Amino acid sequence: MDQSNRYANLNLKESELIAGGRHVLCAYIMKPKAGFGNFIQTAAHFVAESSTGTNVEVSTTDDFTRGVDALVYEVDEANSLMKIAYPIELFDRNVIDGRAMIASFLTLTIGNNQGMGDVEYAKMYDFYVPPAYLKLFDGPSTTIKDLWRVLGRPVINGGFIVGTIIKPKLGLRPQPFANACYDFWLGGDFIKNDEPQGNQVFAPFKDTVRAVADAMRRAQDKTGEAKLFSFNITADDHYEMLARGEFILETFADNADHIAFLVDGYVAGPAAVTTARRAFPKQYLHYHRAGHGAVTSPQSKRGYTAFVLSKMARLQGASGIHTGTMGFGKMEGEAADRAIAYMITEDAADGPYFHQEWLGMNPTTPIISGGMNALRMPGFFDNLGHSNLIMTAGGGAFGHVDGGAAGAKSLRQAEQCWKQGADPVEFAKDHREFARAFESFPQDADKLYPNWRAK
Template sequence: MSEERVLATYVIETPYQLEHAAVVMAGEQSTGTFVSVPGETAFIKETYGANIVRITELEPAAAPSLPGCKPPRGDANPVYRRGEVVLSFPYHNFGPSIPNLLATVAGNLYELREFSGLRLVDLDVPVQFMEKYRGPQFGIAGTRELAGVTGRPLIGTIVKPSIGLSLAELQALVRELALAGIDFIKDDELNGNPPYAPLKDRVRAVMEEIERAADKTGKKVMYAFNITGDIDELRENHDVVVEAGGNCVMVGINSVGFAGVSHLRTFSQVPIHGHRNQWGAMTRSKALGMEFRVYQKLARLAGVDHLHTNGLDNKFYESNESVVRSVRDCLTPMFGDDTVMPVLSSGQWAGTAIDSYRAMQTVDVLHLAGGGIMAHPGGVAAGVESMKQGWEAALAGHSLGEYASTHVELRQAMEKFARP
């Protein structure tokens, strides 16, 4: 039987001794339960049981982070201990299966009453997973080749308003963006296959404008159509895009699941743009859920080529430090050179380019600005130009004000979007 193992790292909080809590974790997620059972033989424990690799004590919490924890009986003033726990699970318990892997490393653990906090912070899986899961098909290099962009980030936007545009209004917007030289456009995740503008009609309308603009400019914009739907709809939706000449599809990872993404990857002929909407429910509490480091590894295995990471100074709760870590995680190879393109979005505008480059030290990002382009005082085309100018300044080592003094679109963006 295989000796390969999966390593899962957690940060836990518990009113019990850390060693006791770790034993409970290992038993619950492998061969044990709350009470000894006759069938749990020494052979079964040794062959299929989870092992405790390491326990590192951290600073205790002043109070329980989550409700529902039951301290040891008779302990009126429990200490809520915190620690990092590394567990090792036999690979042969689940094999190369992301759904069953998740049932093991992120299953009932979150509900155990011994814990007032539990978070999966890292995950290492054996190379056998690549025998089934194909990973990114295009990744950074393939995306750059399709978009015709080298030496700088891809500049993109999200269709705004997110929903409600007629097909004629959408065509006019795509036409303006394409002729302005944008690299990438995506549907908003709210716009899937609505009755007022079915996906087939939207694809046809958009691709007519993209092809027409390409004839004039020689540049074919990459457009990520949102094909999220039930599993049996993914192939049909994908084929609608490809047959119309489309060059990217978008899927809500948490809506279709990793198994849905993996299914799409088996037949996709274009890059898969992975949107992480609903991610906040999985991670916003630091005492619960999982780190992005784990999430991106699973999404990468499943086959996304682009993955949202949030952006600096975003409109959401996430810190800049967390965003930078997420970008670096996406750019760290797992097996071979299978990196994914980090997607910066949320509250982005031309002025965030300099800080992004300084903090991330890479141009291998897709930088999306919705309002930062659509609401530019000089218009949509000026918004696209301002984003390019922001990155020109960043790569040349100029300050924003210095470069804006000779570039009107960047100056207008500063006047509109810069925070006091």
């Protein structure tokens, strides 16, 4: 069925839809499946299944319904491009506080339309949210600013936070776990649970949390510097999340503001993210995106990009989200991913298709992680342009030949090298921990610094 006359209006001007401030805009790369309708016919059906319609005519439709129809307003078949305008009235709102929910945005813009038989594939690359809709989202309540304050750093451009992940990913018992925490903290700032760590039978939650709390006190007493930990509180059950968060804060007591809460936001879902954001607004919300690659990978032509994921996370209220290593680590990523960081940190930024004003909504920290080490950092910072961020290196830290403490210091010195604009190999001559990272990861050293051994 051809629904183009109803759901397509290519005469609409994007600048006017934006100026109007009554529409969410979404940009897709879509391709019709062979043996069905043409591009505009397919786009029209796509819009219907994403707003007010279905695959056939229904007598129950009235003019009020047609008034809130989503509309395809711009197409470019040669480039498989499709842009759709969603009246903001379509999106669900909370009965309890009249605020927006990302779940509704997802259901409409990237829901049932991902199962359409007449569509080969469709993926969202960008979206625009107008002020009237934007202001209804929670946004971040805690930012990197609050971590800088605890660390005793300037609250403006407080600089690089040296982080790690406790490795093994799973298998460490409570005290061996806490011992590794202490070791790293002698040289580093920040430690996060690896994403699956919680209440395993061999590492009970409360025992581990208590041991880590003791390690933090010991590390802070030894170094005279503040230390941070990000605990995984992810669960299916809302009340389990509350129980974990509540126990952690009571346990850390006077160090409670040194605690971040990690949530596996992609697999547990927006509901889990919001549980943490609304229950613990004064604790840094650390969004871990495990599983995201199933749709965000450039190998996938479905779902949405990492850029879209990141932008949504800022609205949901993540204090920080993993943005990837931008091609410099072990995970899939491109150097161009730097644009993701800018979109979540700045008050105004450009996406692949839409400019976004954030209207003073708090920033979300780009958390850099995935096969990073001291050697790979100078190149990463050069591409990004700043080090006002958290970087976690698990293997990069505990894989250091001289141990976790030395690993931490190598990360510290690596960023110091980049800020000083010094040559890494020349810099290494006066910085042992950094130099020993070459010996720790010789395969990496050979690639990045061909004749590092001679010098």
